[PDB]
């Protein structure tokens, strides 16, 4: 659907539906009781009758309202005025979009973006409304055969801003919100696709199409197994040795800045299109969710699509490290000692800790880009899920300023991350009697030792690690990819590009 | 809430709200056209404009409808006409109640009970509506300190019936639906109570209050541990021996028939207020759900309540076999050989198969009432959950007519059961080199060999066994007791008392 | 052994042994060459033959060195000059103490305290040396019947400081170091004692002896089961119900400040003398290590012993929440709903998550002291061990300044903690359909949800929680308590008492 911003009163609107809010208890909102006084207390009369107490989730749809230009007035329960946090705000917009679609409204004017949301300005509210509206419309039915497509008469939504002063921030919010929502959808699509269709070659193919769609700034390269071997990326090669799928590393280069002294921000996404655990096989229960083990590449692709659309004035390189981990007569095994691209040797203790064996070689490989900073994004350890659950991404880094920036972006964007420490006592857990290091450190500090492992390959540049094992998708009835952390990364890049989201 | 029936037209009601259906696609219910044709096509116009497609789940609330004597008109989507089964029908009524409760309607008149529902007459559609509506209002907040009580402005609902020829079947449907819904609530309340509060003594106490509330026809006796020993109920005693809670068997006698030859129907409910498994201890995951191991006794109590309310002209005795299975220094052990009340000996191989050791003695105990039929109700085997899932109760019996009466009742009441076979080959699985029989027959056929076991104690009367391990409760976010098989047993009693089917 | 400081040169010492450093490669320490020149290159000569490369862990004991007033000269490999972190520094000191004890040296003078250690001044270097030396001498043979008591001729060590200007900081360092080491030692002894001896009565007995030994500023109260019942601490009671050991909350009050407005700092330690998990029984493997489930109480006791010795001018109350979690006919069970002292109800899903059930009642109880700050210390979750491993303590709090003061103290003291987030999405995992909350929130974010659970009882004051499940003890061959976080808490108390940092 389309979005736009205007600055006008409810009573002057001539829409299929205007949306205004109501707070507990049956407390018409400022903007709404502007409309009440047009219909002569018609609305407040209905609220005295108990038609809408204002509880969250509650709604009231009025037709043929006395002296109201719009055909419908949709009132939404907003809880309690300032006492509105971002989370309840997102729900109010979700409800609005869903309610409107059970209606015949082909468009609507929404005054909810004017609500007081603790600490968030106009830009944030409009941007979050767009991102939430789009999230609500998501569906993954491309593999179903029944389905007669969903009902969506709502084709456009206009968000109202307080004064003409907010139209500018309002428009920026819409532009940004749509590009990030698109990056999120793309990542959710790639994540939800089965390993059956979304394999390393499928990712390479999406990478090429992205370049074709933005040929003035995007160039894609795809490195195969033979080139990997020539480059000495034996660790990455070992992981996919067992699978019949070819390991393919897709490099998407976006050039938005022409000065010769510009340095690129490199994003490295773990792309295990399926992870069975390998010889160190995973249990049966819920293993189909391992199709999400490539959600890091999914997010990096979404971010690139976002950067290209917004044409940011910076240089970004996204790597989709495609691979597949399968058991078999050619599978690598516990006990193997791999010679990484960097030259350091790694003793494999568990073949299911393969993401870091793919990433280490990509981390050495990306130094040819002389990056400003490298950030890897990966569904890496179950330990991180135990540590930070499904709500916050785990972050580790070898440079404090870069960590601070990523955490600030995670908060601004509402796609949170939390820093976990690295450190010598944890490095020691990787000691090996046979190679420079082992690929695991045992249960204690599992998410930290994995980051420590990665840090031995990133000493030549400032770097951060995002472990999205718990935030990349949900299980249960609503099993599905979240698209995280596209928003955190998009915010990060928006900040780097100079945009002031605080104004 | 309260329910009643009338037979009028929508247009002539003077209610806070009249409910009517709409079928896909946006086709107003005929019962409604008289009403539309009074507002000047006010409803049909809103419908072609897209306000209610008619899909199940959708609703449309209208106030100030042109010339309508009722203040609110609530239209509910019903899908396609004569393609409505009772499951969809119930959802429709469930939706109606929830939607009405979001308005200020103090009472309402509903015409949905006139919907065509496959195989169901007026009596069933009204009774089903009553039972479903009451199911929807269920809440268990007695142990919470927050809460401020849900919003129920709707204190009364009037169901409409086609003609005055259906008023009496409608009133009977309400009388029956209310009594059964109340038994189901009593059983759900008991099941949901913690083992902490709901122990054998609590069930006994509830049993005594029931007798007090209907002292004319109900007498309750409680048999404690000293008496059980004197009765020789050693098997029952061994299960609760490890627990500090005293084992208590509550016998509720309902006499609604004075004829010297009116043999009682005996209901025996497994009342394990907590089942840790004992020495054969259960795993931690979801063990909190073992407070539901007394759901058989909960159901029986519910039926006794139901029968007292309806004053059926039959004799029914309900036994609440209270007990607690705990591990400890005085707990019975795998290997023990128990001398059951029948005199037959039993080798205990697994202490978690304790419900049948509590029941075998109670089934011998009840032969003193010279029962015409005996029915045990028990959350007995994980095997039944695997066999019939959470939707259908497992049934076994030593008498075919009785088993057919029960299945029919299960169908009529929409609380289904399915008969499983018994047999000599399953009996052989209970062979012991040390006793007359072992208490388990291995994994193959676990629900059936449990029935075989019980059957060695029910040879002197017509008997049926209901394994409600999968139907007694549900888990997940909506964790809670279901109250089943109260409806099945109530229908069985109603049928024994002469219920015509009202056809 | 005893410690003291002095500022002198190596050549003028008349000790049984002087300890000096040697850097790699075979480079004689500046303080050394002074000493070499008296014996005339007699030392550098030996370093040329290669008698000490100077690598960490290497040593060289020299007797009758020409012209040296000291009989023995112990040279120690220190690695490389300024690039010495505190970690390697402590190792060098530990080595020194161990090596010295294989000789006849009855006393020694050590110039290693003058080594350059990144970010650590004279005060820290002397204090780390003292704590590490005492740490090295720890043994726990009180329950062994063989042995013949260790060989420790070295009854005194003197650390040299650069000039007389560092003498005072040196003395203060020794004073603090000794008191913290004593505290740490008491915590380790209590932790190491078997559940067989160290039960809740034992902890109470120790708390009473502490009060007796410092009757001027310390008073101890012991609250038993009858009292807890009268206080409404049913949550705490339920956890110990199953065990024959009476639950006992020992309260150690230290009044070091006579002013009316010196509000107390309250420390609460989980004192589960043994944790079998209860009905939700733990696995066999390494369950003996559950004797360490009272290390929180252990640390609070040691911290109290330390604040008593130093006589800090502040008020501190240390609570030792003793309890034992056993399975049995009287144990509380999964499903139980407890009414905590605060009045909030808690549904028990897992009995092994008992520490928080003991702590919530104690956290409510301590509000009677109107504390300025409350800090609980508990071996609480396996999740924490997974999240932060064995090296860093997990910290949660409801007041940021308190959290920052604690993180700062942990760094300063070399007993690290790392903050983890709390939050609404985590609180929601504790939702229950039967109580105000459940005691566990699932595996995702286990450490954090435990934090969220405790925080529901600490809203009336500034609070912090330390989960030392991973830092409190180590297993394997060197199995034993660590005494952490005694040093972190002591440093916290010192800073509150006005400690300088010493420039
Ligand atoms: Cl193969
Ligand atoms: Cl016991
Ligand atoms: Zn893996
Ligand atoms: Zn993986
Ligand atoms: Zn059992
Ligand atoms: Zn049972
Ligand atoms: Zn525990
Ligand atoms: Zn514990």
CATH number of the CATH domain containing A394:
3.40.630.10
Nearest-angstrom CA–CA distance, A270 and A268: 7
- In the sheet where C437-438 sits, what is the strand order? C337-339, C345-347, C437-438
Separation of alpha carbons C89 and C77, rounded Å: 11
**Which residue positions of A form the known binding site?**
270, 275, 293, 352, 354
One domain, residues A340 and A215: yes
Nearest-Cα distance to chain A for C474, in Å, is: 11
| Domain boundary residue, one of C135, C161, C187 | C161
DSSP C441: -
Counting one residue from B and one from C, how many pairs have CB atoms under 8 Å apart?
87
B291's tokens: 């407070």
Tell me which residue of B334, B326, B286, B285 sits closest to C326, measured CA to CA. B326
d(CA C138, CA C158): 20
- C418 to chain A, any CB pair closer than 8 A? The answer is yes
Residues 6+ apart with CB under 8 A from B345: B337, B338, B339, B435, B436, B437
Half-sphere exposure for A204 (CA within 13 Å, toward CB): 15
Give the distance from residue B386's alpha carbon to the nearest chain A alpha carbon, in angstroms.
Answer: 17
Residue B174 in any domain: the answer is no
* Same domain? A152 vs A275: no
Rounded-to-integer distance, Cα C469 and Cα A445, Å: 12
- Which segments of A78-193 are extended strands (E)? 107-110, 156-160
Same domain, residue pair B186 and B132: no
Residues B393 and B469 sit within 8 Å (Cβ to Cβ): no
- The protein residues having their C-beta less than 5 angstroms from ligand 4 (an ion) are A 272, 275, 293, 355
Q: How far is CA B74 from the centre of its chain?
A: 31
**What separation in angstroms does the CA of C105 have from each of C63, C70, C117, C156?**
11, 11, 27, 9
> What single string gives the DSSP state of each residue in B318-329?
EEEEEEEE--ST
How far is the C-alpha of A477 from the C-alpha of C4, rounded, in Å? Answer: 68
Are residues B115 and B190 located together in one domain of the fold? no
In chain B, the largest separation of any two C-alpha atoms, in whole Å, equals 85
Contact between residue C273 and residue C198 where contact means Cβ atoms under 8 Å apart: yes
CA of B222: how far to CAs of B225, B274, B308, B319, C483, in Å? Answer: 10, 19, 19, 10, 56
Which residue among A389, A420, A448 sits closest to C445, beta carbon to beta carbon? A389
What are the residue ranges of helices labelled H in C196-322?
A: 200-213, 225-231, 234-241, 295-310
In the A/B pair of chains, how many CB contacts fall below 8 A? 27
* C411, part of any domain: yes
Indicate which residues of C carry an active-site annotation. Answer: 282, 356
Same domain? B252 vs B132: no
- The answer to whether position B87 is within a domain reads yes
- Token digits for C392? 């860093």
Cα dihedral: C286, C287, C289, C290 (round 10): 160
Report residue B174: phi and psi, to 5°. -70, -45
The nearest CA of chain B is from the CA of A153 a distance in Å of: 9
Residue A356 alpha carbon to ligand 3 centre in Å: 9
Contact criterion met (CB below 8 Å) for A43 and A62: yes
| Experiment type | X-ray
Measured torsion, CA atoms of residues C467, C473, C476, C477, in degrees rounded to the nearest 10: 170
- Look-up: residue for tokens 């008469």? A153
Is residue A60 within 8 A of residue A51, CB to CB? The reply is yes
- Are the C-beta atoms of A376 and A359 separated by less than 8 Å? yes
Question: How far B26 CA sits from the closest chain A CA (Å)?
Answer: 12
Strands B18-23 and B27-28: antiparallel
Do residue B196 and residue C344 have CB atoms under 8 angstroms apart?
A: no
Q: Rounded to an integer, what distance in angstroms lies between the CA atom of residue B333 and that of residue B322?
A: 20
Residue B49 touches chain C, beta carbons under 8 Å: no
Query: Does the distance separating the beta carbons of A424 and C389 come in below 8 Å?
Result: no
> What distance in Å separates the CA atoms of residue B306 and residue B492, rounded to the nearest whole number?
12
Distance of CA A24 to the CA centre of its chain: 33
Residue A11: count of CB within 10 angstroms of its CB: 17
Contacts of A153 in chain B (CB under 8 A): 50
Residues 6+ apart with CB under 8 A from A327: A242, A276, A277, A278, A279, A281
Residues A348 and A346: their CA atoms lie apart, in Å, by 6
Active-site residue (options: B80, B282, B456, B460): B282
Shortest distance between the Cα of B438 and any Cα of chain A, in A, equals 34
Annotated binding site of C for Mn(2+): 270, 275, 293, 352, 354
- Please check whether residues B146 and B192 belong to one and the same domain: no
Residues C352 and C237 in one domain: yes
Which of A284, A292, A297, A285 has its CA nearest to residue A194? A292
| Residues of A in Cβ contact (< 8 Å) with B60 | 61
How many folded domains does chain B comprise? 2
- Whether residues A407 and A440 share a domain: the answer is yes
**Closest-CA residue to B352 (of B375, B383, B392):** B383
A200 within a domain of the structure (yes/no): yes
Whether residue A108 contacts residue A157, with contact meaning beta carbons closer than 8 Å, is answered with yes
3-state SS, residue B418 = strand
Residue B168 forms part of a structural domain: no
Beta bridge partners of C150: none
Tell me the ligand closest to C323's alpha carbon.
Answer: 8
Of A73, A86, A81, whose CA–CA distance to A32 is shortest?
A73
Given B72, B120, B356, B484, the catalytic residue: B356
Q: Is the domain of A204 the same as that of A347?
A: yes
Say if A123 falls within a structural domain: yes
Say how far apart CA C95 and CA C55 lie, in whole Å.
Answer: 12
Q: Which of B145, B192, B195 sits opposite C343 (nearest CB)?
A: B145
Ligand nearest, relative to CA of residue B270: 6
Beta strands in A81-155, from DSSP E residues, in sequence order: 107-110
Question: Which residues span the domain enclosing B418?
Answer: 179-498
Cα separation, A478 vs A432, in Å, equals 42
Please list the residues that pair with C120 across neighbouring strands: C117
Chain C, nearest residue to B475 by Cα: C433
Q: How far apart are CA A359 and CA A370, in angstroms?
A: 17
Distance separating alpha carbons of residues A125 and A121, to the nearest angstrom: 6
Q: Which of residues 94-153 of A touch B (CB under 8 A)?
A: 102-104, 151, 153
Q: Which of A53, A64, A102 sits opposite B58 (nearest CB)?
A: A102
Domain end, chosen from B161, B187, B210, is at: B161
Residue C38 in any domain: the answer is yes
Cβ–Cβ contact A447 with C under 8 A: yes
Omega within 30 of 0 (cis) for the link into B25? yes
Nearest to B330 by CA among B279, B287, B273: B279
Which of B141, B276, B280, B282 has the highest number of chain C CBs within 10 A, making it the mutation to test binding with C?
Answer: B276
Q: Which of C161, C188, C205 is the last residue of a domain?
A: C161
| Catalytic site positions of A | 282, 356
Pull the structure tokens for residue C85.
């972190």
Q: Alpha-carbon torsion A208, A214, A215, A221, what sign?
A: negative
CATH number at residue A76: 3.40.220.10
Residue C221's beta-bridge partner residues? C251
One domain, residues B199 and B227: yes
A119 to A3, A86, A412: CA distances (angstroms): 24, 9, 10
Q: How many CA atoms lie within 13 A of B31 on its CB side?
A: 27
**C183 shares a domain with C147:** no
C-alpha closest to that of A51 among B109, B61, B14: B61
CA distance C386 to chain A (A): 5
A298 CB neighbour count, 10 Å cutoff: 36
Q: Tokens 């304790």 map to which residue?
A: B354
A123 and A60 within one domain: yes
Task: State the DSSP code for B280.
Answer: S
Which pair of structure tokens corresponds to residue A404?
A: 């601070």
In a domain, B169, yes or no: no
Active site residue B479: no
Question: How far is the C-alpha of C346 from the C-alpha of C450, rounded, in Å?
Answer: 13
Rounded to whole angstroms, the Cα distance separating C19 from C72 reads 9
Q: How many helices (H) and strands (E) does chain C have?
A: 15, 20
User: Residue C410 and residue C488: Cα distance in Å, rounded?
Assistant: 5
Q: Tell how strand A345-347 and strand A337-339 pair up.
A: antiparallel
CB of C348 less than 8 A from some CB of B: yes
What's the DSSP call for residue C219? E
Residues 6+ apart with CB under 8 A from B202: B193, B273
Report yes or no: A233 and A358 within 8 Å, Cβ to Cβ: no
Q: How many helices (H) and strands (E) does chain A have?
A: 15, 20
Closest CA to C44 of C17, C90, C75: C75
Supply the Cα-derived Rg of chain A in whole angstroms: 25
Side-chain-facing half-sphere of C277: CA atoms under 13 Å: 19
Q: Does C451 touch chain A (CB under 8 A)?
A: no
Q: How many CB pairs under 8 A join A and C?
A: 74
Smallest CA-to-CA distance from C410 within C389, C398, C387, C394 is with C394
A320 Cα to the center of ligand 4, angstroms: 14
Could you confirm whether B282 is annotated as catalytic? yes
Nearest of A75, A53, A76 to residue A62 by alpha carbon: A75
All residues at 6 or more sequence positions from B10 whose CB lies less than 8 Å from its CB, including other chains:
B18, B20, B31, B32, B34, B35, B70, B109, B111
Query: Quick check: B478 and C435 CB within 8 A?
Result: no
Task: Write out the two tokens for A213.
Answer: 């769609």
Chains touching chain C, criterion 3+ CB pairs below 8 Å:
A, B
**C383 to A388: CB separation less than 8 angstroms, yes or no:** no
Nearest to B274 by CA among B338, B217, B354, B187: B354
Residue partners of A338: CB distance under 8 A and separation at least 6: A234, A235, A238, A332, A345, A346, A348, A357, A435
Residue with tokens 């973006």: A113
């Amino acid at each position: 659907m389309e979005f736009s911003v205007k600055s006008g009163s409810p009573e002057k609107q001539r829409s299929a539906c205007i949306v205004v809010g109501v707070f507990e208890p049956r407390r018409l909102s400022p903007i709404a009781e502007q409309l009440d006084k047009i219909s002569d207390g018609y609305i407040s009369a209905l609220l005295r009758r108990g038609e809408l107490e204002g509880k969250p989730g509650q709604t009231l749809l009025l037709h043929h309202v006395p002296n109201v230009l719009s055909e419908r007035i949709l009132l939404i329960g907003c809880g309690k005025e300032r006492e509105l946090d971002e989370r309840q705000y997102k729900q109010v917009i979700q409800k609005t979009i869903n309610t409107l679609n059970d209606t015949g409204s082909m468009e609507a004017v929404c005054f909810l973006t004017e609500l007081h949301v603790k600490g968030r300005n106009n830009y944030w509210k409009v941007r979050q409304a767009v991102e939430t509206a789009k999230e609500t419309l998501y569906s993954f039915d491309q593999l179903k055969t029944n389905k007669s497509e969903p009902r969506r008469p709502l084709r456009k939504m206009v968000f109202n801003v307080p004064t003409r002063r907010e139209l500018t921030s309002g428009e920026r919010a819409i532009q940004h919100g749509l590009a990030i929502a698109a990056g999120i959808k793309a990542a959710k699509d790639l994540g939800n696709m089965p390993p059956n269709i979304c394999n390393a070659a499928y990712l390479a193919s999406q990478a090429r199409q992205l370049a074709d769609s933005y040929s003035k700034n995007v160039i894609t390269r795809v490195i195969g197994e033979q080139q990997m071997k020539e480059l000495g990326m034996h660790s990455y090669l070992a992981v996919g040795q067992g699978s019949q799928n070819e390991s393919l590393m897709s490099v998407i280069e976006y050039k938005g800045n022409a000065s010769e002294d510009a340095r690129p921000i490199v994003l490295v996404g773990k792309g295990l299109t399926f992870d069975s655990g390998g010889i160190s096989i995973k249990p049966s229960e819920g293993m189909d969710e391992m199709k999400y083990d490539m959600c890091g590449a999914a997010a990096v692709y979404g971010v690139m699509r976002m950067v290209a659309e917004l044409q940011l004035p910076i240089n970004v390189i996204g790597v989709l490290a495609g691979c597949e981990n399968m058991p078999g007569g050619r599978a690598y095994r516990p006990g193997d000692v791999l010679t990484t691209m960097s030259g350091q040797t790694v003793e494999v203790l568990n073949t299911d800790a393969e993401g870091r064996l793919v990433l280490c070689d990509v981390l050495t490989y990306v130094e040819r880009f002389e990056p400003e900073a490298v950030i890897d994004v990966a569904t890496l350890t179950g330990a991180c899920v135990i540590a930070l659950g499904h709500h916050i991404t785990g972050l580790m880094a070898n440079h404090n300023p870069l960590a601070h920036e990523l955490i600030a972006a995670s908060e601004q964007s509402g796609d949170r991350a939390w820093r976990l420490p690295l450190g010598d006592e944890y490095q020691e857990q990787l000691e090996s009697n046979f190679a420079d290091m082992a690929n695991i450190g045992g249960r204690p500090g599992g998410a930290i030792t994995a980051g420590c492992f990665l840090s031995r390959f990133t000493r030549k540049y400032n770097w951060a690690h995002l472990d999205i094992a718990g935030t990349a998708w949900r299980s249960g009835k609503a099993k599905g990819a979240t698209g995280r952390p596209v928003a955190l990364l998009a915010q990060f890049l928006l900040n780097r590009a100079g945009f002031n989201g605080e104004e």
